[PDB]
C-alpha cells in the first residue's frame, strides 16, 4: 500500500535523477572547468541503481517459481455489485410506486 | 482496497436496511388505513 508505492516512487525518482545526471555529465564533458568533477558523481548515481539491483537481489523473493498474492479477493467486489444491483432494483420499484401514486391523483 | 470496499458495502447495507425499516412503517400505516374500509 503506502510502503510499496513509496519504494516504487523512490526507484522512479532514482532512475530519473540518474538519467538527468548522465545528461548533465554529457553536456559538461562535451564542450566548455571544475564542475565536471560533479559529473563523476553521476557515475556514483549509477552505482545507486546497482544498490537498487542489490535491493532487488536480496528482496523478498517469496517463491521465485510462482506468483504470490493468492486470490483477487474480489468477492467483496462481487458483493458490491450485488448491493448496487439491489439499490437499482429498489430505485426501480420506488419509481413504479411513484408513477402509480401520480396516476392516483 | 478490501477494507475500503468492505466499509462501502457496509454503508450500502445500512442504507438499504434503514430504507426497509422506513418502508415497513409506511406499509403498516397504509395497510391499516386500507383494510379499515371495504368498497
Amino acid at each position: 500500500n503506502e510502503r510499496l508505492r513509496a519504494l516504487e516512487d523512490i526507484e522512479r525518482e532514482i532512475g530519473a535523477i540518474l538519467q538527468n545526471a548522465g545528461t548533465a555529465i554529457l553536456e559538461l564533458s562535451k564542450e566548455k572547468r571544475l564542475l565536471d568533477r560533479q559529473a563523476a558523481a553521476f557515475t556514483t548515481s549509477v552505482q545507486h541503481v546497482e544498490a537498487e539491483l542489490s535491493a532487488q537481489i536480496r528482496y523478498l523473493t517469496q517463491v521465485a517459481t510462482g506468483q504470490p498474492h493468492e486470490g483477487s479477493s474480489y468477492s467483496s467486489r462481487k458483493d458490491c455489485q450485488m448491493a448496487l444491483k439491489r439499490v437499482d432494483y429498489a430505485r426501480l420499484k420506488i419509481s413504479d410506486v411513484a408513477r402509480t401514486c401520480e396516476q392516483m391523483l | 482496497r478490501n477494507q475500503q470496499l468492505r466499509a462501502l458495502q457496509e454503508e450500502c447495507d445500512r442504507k438499504l436496511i434503514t430504507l426497509r425499516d422506513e418502508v415497513s412503517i409506511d406499509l403498516y400505516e397504509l395497510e391499516e388505513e386500507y383494510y379499515s374500509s371495504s368498497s
Binding site: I94, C101 | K15, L19, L30
Partner: peptide
C-alpha cells in the same frame, strides 16, 4: 373522511419515497 385520509397517507408515502430516492441517488453518487 376516508378519501381525505387516503389522500393524506398517499402524500406522506410519496414524500417519504421522494426523500428515499434523493438519499439513494446521494449514496450511489459515492
Amino acid at each position: 373522511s376516508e378519501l381525505q385520509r387516503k389522500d393524506a397517507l398517499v402524500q406522506k408515502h410519496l414524500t417519504k419515497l421522494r426523500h428515499w430516492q434523493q438519499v439513494l441517488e446521494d449514496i450511489n453518487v459515492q
